[PDB]
Symmetry: D2
Subunit: 117 residues, 4 copies
């Protein structure tokens, strides 16, 4: 289902394991930004979705600090999984960077992304 290797249009990649648990654990690699190599991810999802043909709700977080680099920032993704012969995940995202109290009005970016398996 959700478990496996997914891609986006920018060329970023992410690998996940989805547990019975309702938990999401894995790594993310960004093709853009002040980022190099792989980063740790964690999240949650609805493990008992409805039957009516609606999608499956989920979300996950990434902080941009690893052994090579630290951007002093973090992104969260919110969306849903749609299954079938051509599975996808549709999301919207927020990225916050640390700032002074003075610069806080410009700390946060918003965008959206589709991943496919």
């Amino acid at each position: 289902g959700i478990t496996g290797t997914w891609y986006n249009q920018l060329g970023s990649t992410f690998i996940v394991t989805a547990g019975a648990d309702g938990a999401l654990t894995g790594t993310y690699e960004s093709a853009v930004g002040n980022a190099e190599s792989r980063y740790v991810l964690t999240g949650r999802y609805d493990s008992a979705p409805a039957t009516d043909g609606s999608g499956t709700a989920l979300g996950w977080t990434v902080a941009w600090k690893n052994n090579y680099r630290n951007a002093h920032s973090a992104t969260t993704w919110s969306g849903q999984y749609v299954g079938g012969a051509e599975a996808r995940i549709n999301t919207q995202w927020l990225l916050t960077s640390g700032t002074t109290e003075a610069n806080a009005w410009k700390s946060t970016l918003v965008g959206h992304a589709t991943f496919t398996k």
Copy 2:
């Protein structure tokens, strides 16, 4: 810093532990919506912030299924921690519900919130 008990002015509350490894682990109790009791939370944060006076970036997720009910929905929170005499967490949030293909245009709310400690 972050480790402790926090609240927002809706009356919602959460408890968290921040580790040296960059994780966030705890549980959340909502005062509004289709929810009762405690729900699992997980996330990440910047464990080595700049020292120029800027805040510490973080995020976390909750999915609204526990032993008592399932709302078929999830929320993510994005923002930063600001410490000192009056420590706060300032965030923006996204809530997504599972909808059919036709109704996806109205599946996601956006909002903001300030939490205060102790």
Copy 3:
């Protein structure tokens, strides 16, 4: 550039004129939600863009009251125009409904949309 007729893949459509004075003026017809017929639109855009290959920034608003019905709600669209052989407008949107003080936490949806011309 912008002046003309545009659509999104929900089937919604709008007509607009962009003036030398920086205004946007037209009307919008929605294919979904609590809406029938045409609604008034107004906005602004960058009338003197950079020439490095970047897009042209703009925005517009619609309030969902006309002669036939009133939904007690409004939407704003924020984004940019990209011209050439295949011209597009790429946006993100906010829809706010009038709620009581208690329900304000769930008054606003967020979404995105790409429009295509002619």
Copy 4:
């Protein structure tokens, strides 16, 4: 009601006239950003709100080009007006700047603001 002079916590100011019309027209001055002096604004609002004690829906747009400066960007505000002895307007905002197709993933900021009269 909505007509008059409003302020925010940053020290930005805006003056509006709200017509029978359902229209919003005025100017905005920013205390932050790549901005100097006053800018033209336009928008719409619900001129026949419900009676139940819910607020009044509205929105407005600003492009950051005037006779002194041009930032190549625009902000839109979405929210509602709440009347009484202590009137306010509560909103959320999006700011887009022009970018290349390559840099589009970071074109848009999001935040929120309360104004009082």
